[PDB]
Design a protein around this ligand. Structure first.
Ligand SMILES: [Cl-]
Ligand SMILES: [Cl-]
Ligand SMILES: [Cl-]
Lengths: 242, 243
């Protein structure tokens, strides 16, 4: 079941922001959100799509392992961190779009489409450009659907090999300390309105896992840091992290 | 492998009234560094750093099925409160839960434990002593440079166990991670046979390189346990490996 916590709206309004956070207590099989309506509203995934894209590329052997080098093609693109060699870990960390656009070209429309359906991923729709449908094409996913997808990934329940799922969860590693581990991926959809930021992932504790997915209106890139900060405010209010 | 002595790093021990060795290995350049070459090659009891090979063996023999399988508490109230509860592989490594791993060793048995440690080229490969305590008070000995040689094989999935077991153990070694680095490591604290020492062994993952490390230091009281990580981090920062 889900549970609306209207009080959670404070963490968006006090930063002059609008958005939704969805939390799922894995032990209790219970979910929470500040707004049920926006929690089920579907948006472009933008770079959160790197999670399923990585999985498919690994499963098909386009990516051999997490340290295989994807050599820069020498084309100077607008983001300097993209204009160099990467592996899967740094391609995820630096959200290196051209690396993932090449994965999509190699996967191809037929296999991309069939795998998204097998994942039950959002509307499972790849309409648009093969190399950009997750930025300006027809694919859409909600915060609650991100959580459903992530829980399957966490439990190795997607129907790719276990190895492919473990490698992707490695590549999602964002923060770890003696209190918690976070595996997650940011997103920033700017190509079509509404411009939004994403953060989806989970928090591993000693004895529970808490899945999360948030999106928020992002008129300016100046607020991108709020994706993680609002999420962390909610986690601390709920005593999930100190 | 190829080591170079940097005696100036001794200040990181002596300024804390400590005595020990740190070994650092630059994977890209295939180059090693240490404050003291002799102690870097001196073998000690591994204590709970043995949980790294013991985990690998237990996973590959199916004694442990996966990293969230529950090891029920055996009902004995031991001195370390964090031990007196159910554990999985992740939390058994994090809280260094010895009795869980003593039961693994009893399930593994002497013949398979010996064969696997020979396969890993682990230290002196000697399992003399009690099957369930030889890494705390038996015959096994391993040096800081040997720890690194072992960890490099694990990092590259080159040890003679399944890739899955190696990936699970590297996940279970996860200690710290941020936007600058990831540390996969394991502490140890050898108290049963003199000289009592502390250990920290592992590696630092950067965007473009991997730095392996193994340190040990004398530990006559538990008061200095935090220096295992703090001295390592002092060296890492001075060398610009971490901010
Ligand atoms: Cl939409
Ligand atoms: Cl992308
Ligand atoms: Cl142990």
């Amino acid at each position: 079941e889900w549970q609306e916590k209207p009080s959670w709206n404070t963490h968006f309004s006090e930063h002059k922001a609008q958005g939704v956070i969805v939390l799922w207590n894995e032990n209790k099989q219970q979910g929470f959100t500040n707004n049920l309506k926006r929690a089920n509203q579907a948006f472009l995934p933008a770079s959160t799509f790197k999670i399923p894209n990585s999985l498919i590329a690994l499963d098909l052997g386009v990516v051999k392992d997490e340290h295989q080098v994807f050599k820069w093609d020498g084309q100077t693109r607008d983001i300097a961190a993209w204009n160099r060699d990467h592996d899967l870990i740094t391609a995820m960390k630096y959200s290196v779009v051209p690396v993932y656009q090449e994965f999509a070209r190699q996967i191809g429309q037929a296999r991309m489409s069939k795998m998204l359906h097998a994942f039950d991923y959002g509307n499972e729709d790849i309409s648009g450009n093969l190399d950009s449908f997750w930025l300006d094409g027809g694919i859409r996913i909600s915060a609650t659907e991100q959580v459903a997808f992530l829980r399957k990934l966490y439990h190795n329940k997607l129907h790719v090999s276990e190895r492919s799922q473990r490698i992707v969860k490695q590549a999602m590693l964002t923060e770890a300390n003696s209190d918690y581990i976070i595996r997650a991926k940011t997103g920033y959809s700017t190509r079509i309105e509404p411009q939004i930021g994403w953060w989806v992932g989970w928090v591993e504790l000693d004895d529970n896992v808490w899945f999360f997915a948030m999106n928020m209106d992002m008129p300016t890139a100046d607020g991108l840091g709020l994706r993680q900060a609002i999420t962390k405010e909610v986690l601390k209010q709920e005593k999930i992290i100190p």
